[PDB]
Every structure is written in C-alpha cells, then in structure tokens.
Design a protein around this ligand. Sequence first.
Ligand SMILES: CC(=O)N[C@H]1[C@H]([C@H](O)[C@H](O)CO)O[C@@](OC[C@H]2O[C@@H](O[C@H]3[C@H](O)[C@@H](O)[C@H](O)O[C@@H]3CO)[C@H](O)[C@@H](O)[C@H]2O)(C(=O)O)C[C@@H]1O
Length: 811
Amino acid sequence: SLANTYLLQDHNTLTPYTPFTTPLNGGLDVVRAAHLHPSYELVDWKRVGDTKLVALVRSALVRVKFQDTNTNQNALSFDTQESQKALNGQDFASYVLIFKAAPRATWVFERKIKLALPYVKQESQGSGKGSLYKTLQDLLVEQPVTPYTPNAGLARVNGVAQDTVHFGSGQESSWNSQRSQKGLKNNPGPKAVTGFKLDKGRAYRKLNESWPVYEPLDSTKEGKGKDESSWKNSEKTTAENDAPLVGMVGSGAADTATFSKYLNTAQALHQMGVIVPGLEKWTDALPNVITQLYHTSTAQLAYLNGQIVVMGSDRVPSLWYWVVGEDQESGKATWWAKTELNWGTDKQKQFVENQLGFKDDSNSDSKNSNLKAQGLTQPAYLIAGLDVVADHLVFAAFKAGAVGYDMTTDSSASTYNQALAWSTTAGLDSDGGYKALVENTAGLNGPINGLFTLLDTFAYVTPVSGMKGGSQNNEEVQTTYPVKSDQKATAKIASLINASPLNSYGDDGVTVFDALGLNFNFKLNEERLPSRTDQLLVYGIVNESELKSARENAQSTSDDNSNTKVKWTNTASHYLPVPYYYSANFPEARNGVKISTLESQATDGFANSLLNFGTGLKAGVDPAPVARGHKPNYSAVLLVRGGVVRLNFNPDTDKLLDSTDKNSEPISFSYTPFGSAESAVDLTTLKDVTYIAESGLWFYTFDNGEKPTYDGKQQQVKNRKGYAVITVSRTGIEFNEDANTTTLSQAPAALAVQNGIASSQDDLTGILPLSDEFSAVITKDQTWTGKVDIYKNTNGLFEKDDQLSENVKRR
Ligand SMILES: CC(=O)N[C@H]1[C@H]([C@H](O)[C@H](O)CO)O[C@@](OC[C@H]2O[C@@H](O[C@H]3[C@H](O)[C@@H](O)[C@H](O)O[C@@H]3CO)[C@H](O)[C@@H](O)[C@H]2O)(C(=O)O)C[C@@H]1O
C-alpha cells in the first residue's frame, strides 16, 4: 500500500519510511524514549503486529561478578562499584522495551523489562547432589574467535594417546592382550588422541578472569592457554610489545612492533559485542568473562503472545536465554546447561553429554566439577536465530564445543595440563542409511579414531565399529572415558567451553577431516560419515508451554528443584561441516594435513576455513496455493558458511516435518551450497533479514560498515563502504503440492543468490521493498542522509533503473 511504512535502524534510532522512499519523521530514539542512560545500545527490535514494537537494549558499563570463597543468595551479581569505576575515564542491565503506536508514525513508550542474571546457589562452609556452582568455579571459557583468527591460531598441540592413559608410559605393548578387561574390547585404536594441551595457545579464562585482546598466530608455538598466571607475569609484556594498538609512542588521548608472535584484535572484538574499554564511541585489561558473557548474551529476541524470548549472539557462546513476561518488572535467564534438547536420537544426545566430562559412582570428589558429573546437559550455543511463526517459536544454533579438562596438581600425570576431547565420526563399517549412521557407536564413550592405513590408502576413521568386532563379526566394539581404571575415584575433571562448534583443537588430520566433512565409507554409492560432537547444528520448534516451563525454571531459587531440567522435545541435531573447498588443500570448485598446515582460501569474511558459523534464521509462510483443507506450509532459512540451510515443519502437527523412514535423510533439514559469488559475501556483516509474505522470498541485507576498523596486523580494513543483498528462494516439491503428495522422498530446499543489489561505494541506510518488481536502496554518505536508488527485478535479477533513480533524486 502507500499507508504501509517500512522501519529502518541507525544506531539507536528507528526511522519510518513510506513507499515514496521519503521518511515520515526523524524516527524514534529507543534509548532516549525509554529514559535510559547514554551508554545504551539498541541490539534488536521487532514490530509486533500493527500497534506494538518490542526492542532490546544493552550497556557496555554493565559489570557482572561471581563469588568463590549467605542463605538463598545468588553467586552471580551485578557489581555497581566497577560499573561506576568505568564511567570515569544502576547496574546498567539489559532491557526489553514495549512501545505503543501513536498518531502519525510515532511511538509512545509503554514499559521496560530488566533481563536479570540467571540464578546459581552459592556454597559456604563459613555461613550455613549435582552442583552447577562447582562447575562454574572451574569453568574455563575460550577467548572469542575473531574474523582475523588464522587456522594455526586454532591449532593446539594434540593430547596424549589412550594406550598411555590406561597402561602408563612403557606398558602400551599389552593393549591387545588387556583391552577386553580394561573396557576397550575390540577397540582398534590404541594411538587414539585423548584431547589437546591447554599449556599454551589461545586464552582460556575462569569466570572472574579476563580474555586478552592479543591472540596467537600459531598455538603450537606461542600463546599461554589456560595458564593465566604465566601470561600476566611474563607473556602479557611480550604480547603488548609484539602487537601494540595503532599509536606506539602516541596512544595518550583521554623487537618493537613486528606482529610475528601475536595479532591485536581489539577492533574485531568490539564489533562482536565484546566490551573493549577505550574503544568506546558512545594497558587497561578487559572486563571479566562473566560480564562479556552477560553483554554478548543479550543480542536477539522474539515475541509470543505476552512472552519475550531473548537469545545470544552467533559469534560468542551463550550459556543462558530469557523467557520474560510482558507483565513482569524483571526476569532471570534460563540456563542452557539445564535446557535438555532432543538431538534426534538417544545416541546423538549421549555422544555430546559423554564428552561433557567424567562421571563414575566410585568418584564423589568436589574438584571433579564437570557438567556430566553434576548431571547437567549441553551448556553453550552459537545462536543463529529465533523467529515466531504460527503461534510457535523456531530457532537454530551451532552447539559450541564443551569438553572436560584434567585439573591434577601432579605434573607427571598423563592427562596433566590438557583438555579431553575425541573424534565421533561413524565407523567405516557402519550400516547404511541416516538413522543407521547417526546411531553408530564409533567414539561414543571414548577415543577410537586416528590414522588407519587400510591397504595402500589412509583413513582417519575406525574400520571396525558397533556390533562387528571379533573374528565372528557379531561382538561389541567397546569404548571408555580417558581416565585410568585405578585413578577413577581420585579423578579431578572440570568443565571447559570453546568459542566455536568443535570439541578438539588437536593439531591433526582427524580433526581437520571432522570439521571439513571429508570422512566417507568405501561403498559404491559412497555416503559421508557424520560427527556427533563436531560442527553440529541444533534447530527446532518450541511452544508457549515449553517456554512457560523454561520461565518457571529460571525463577526457581535452586531449593529441592535445583536438579530439574527443561525438556524441549521438538528439536533436532545435524552434522554441518565447512566446505572442504574453502581450504586451499582440497579445492573442488605433504605428510598429511593438520590444523596448522591447513591453508585457507575462504573469502566469506573469516581468516580461517575450519570453523562453521550460522546467521540470520528467518521463518516464512509459503504463499503457494493451500491443499484440501490443510494448514499453510512454513519453513525457516539460515545462512551458514558455504550455503543456505532450510528447516521444514509440518503445519498440522506444528512439529519438525518427518518422513516415518529411518534410512532416508531427514526431510526437516536441507543444505544447498551457494555459488562462488555468494561465497564472496562477508557473513559477519548481516544487518537485516526480511521475508516478503507475497513473493515467498527472503532478503538478506549485508552492510560493509559492520566490519571492524583494523585487522590483527593493525591495518585499516578495506571495502568498509558498501553493501550486498542475497535472495533465498524455495525450491523442490512442496508438502501437499497436489493430492497424492503424502510423504516426500526428498526435502524442500532453498537457493541463495547475490541478486544484484550490491555496491562498494556508499554507507547503506536500508532497502525498502517497494513492490515484487522494484526496491529502493536508501544510502547516507552525503550531507542530510538519503541518496535513494531504484532497482528493478528482471526474472529474479536486480538491475539499477537509471531513469527512476534519477527521477526520485531531485530533492
Ligand atoms: C588410531 C590407531 O591406533 N591407529 C593405528 C593403526 C591401528 O592400530 C590398526 O590399523 C588397527 O588396529 O595401526 C597403524 O599402524 C599399523 C602397523 O602397526 C605396526 O605395529 C607397530 C605399532 O607401533 C604398534 O602396534 C606396536 O606396538 O609396535 C609396532 C612397531 O614395532 C605393525 O608392525 C604393522 O604391520 C602395521 O599393522 C596404522 O597406521 O594403520 C598405526 C596407527 O597409529
């Protein structure tokens, strides 16, 4: 219509635009309308129906604190003292703002909702069963992955082999003769890696420790890992001297600088939503991990009939999400370590949980604080998005790597100073079909994969798995957690989390093969063998009752219900590796390849070709003709590294669209690799996602300005000016297209294309989809803001309309 207005953001302002391409007023400054502090930033907003507008705001002054040596007191709190200290040179919590429509365009503020810290029960032998508190006390979170992190930066030294673990050094000879009784019966991999060393490399910090701005170029050579003591005492200076910020003897405004040991990524971190004091627009250390965790956690929202869901960023792992009511004043976050998801099958759930840490009935140690031991599920996610459709919430995220680590004081120990993680790729001998493949026992309870020299060829997966061991081939192929039998009651395994969807950073081929999807069986109609811990995509459909249950849980003050979990049944997991061709080694349009030797040819806005990232989840109802009295079809689409994924749902059941067949690949998931041109689009710069109800199309708008100011080698970023638009469109046979279209053999897919709306010249304001044929690109750069350029769609391909753009341009 003409009456319809398109809203567009610019920092904290939301300006209404008409189809004449002109704005109705100077917009709504969400912060100043809410009577909020000037250090506030608007992070997400949604125009609920015709008269409501919900928004999300956060502050870089927020300061969080965790206590580790009274009654119903929470161990997690806001530190208003530090929040005040930052101001020079209340709690500044995040808020959900509700607005009501008024005369002309304009909005009127209606209320504010505080997103309070999640609850955790504090213990004290000087004041007054699974403990999330113990976990947190020894929880080591990785320093965030930047777009400037090279492949060798991820490359951590491999851990010890499992034959050394169970037999000791010098007694490995007796593997085959004693595997049967040591719980490794028919296990063919004695040389299987237990994990990776935490002695050096990229930073791993405790909940009250801080991540540094500097990062290793190669974690086999430099970095200090979890060793905060050594960094602070000697390596801090080395790092500072190697990678100082722009202005060496000229920073004061409030063997010298080689960049061969570290990369200074202060600029990249800032944009990721990480608080970097000094780089504030609205040397000194960064705020503690728990603070950045709260700040980066309040990034995305949705609205479902008086209920606001708030999830975290797609760039930093999130441990908690809010389910606040429109009526409430505040509201605590719900722990992900307490939100149990259906991973498709019990075995798929097991794979993940089993790697969370060490649990045995002989062990009752407090120092053994890992999530598995505290009976807690998967803690962290890299949330791609959430969207509301047909009175249901849909979401997608990449499961972040959450492993166990050895806390032992004993420096002569096998698993001393290392993280415990192993490959979970299905055996070469796996039975055929999807169900058969995901439920394969290879690496379920412990390591099994490594280099196997099958004839005149190599294989990084086990050639014997499941119920195929022994001479007769009917025996069990066994697997066990890397902790020696006699060392079980004494074991001190804490919990560790990576800022990526991988479990092991072990500098080997097996990891590279798991992350790139290169493990395949030797069948005629060759099937790819999947991982059940590395590069996993979690997605699903939740209802109001599941969300209420997630809210009630968060408001609980631990008590007797302290070990009660949230069960989201209509979710699923899917192995989503990065394209192998993104690396220069294996493009398909020496002594083996390890993480550190893996050269990248990725153009998608990352210095690596090892880690997967997911962004812009958007639902959308198919405008196609409806079947014989059936509900209209709807799907969700998202952009991952290398292609578009489409999540399909049964409208009738309001559940994930299933086929009732175990062998066939799931019809609720589809992945289509996109072309060379769309692989050239920087995915970290996604400004907006938009679905056109009438054309059944998704429009992903990317803005170059969202790129950092300087790279790791402290040089100004190129192509900062410009924008690019991608169109996603439905493809294939649709659920109930005709009468006999009962159950579909294939899954309905999507197609990502750079439709032609692109520039590398001006600063984008936004794109107003005028009609199915014409769209205007509104650009600033010039004095006043508003250049306007009309683009016409020709068979799905945009071309600038010289005539029309020249027309609208005269004031
Ligand atoms: C993950 C893993 O452990 N992979 C190893 C692999 C497998 O153990 C088997 O293929 C299946 O069980 O074997 C690899 O090497 C095969 C050769 O092993 C040689 O034995 C060595 C070896 O170091 C030890 O097994 C032994 O204690 O000492 C021997 C040297 O003195 C054999 O002599 C040879 O015939 C092969 O069988 C493989 O790459 O396939 C090694 C993997 O680490």
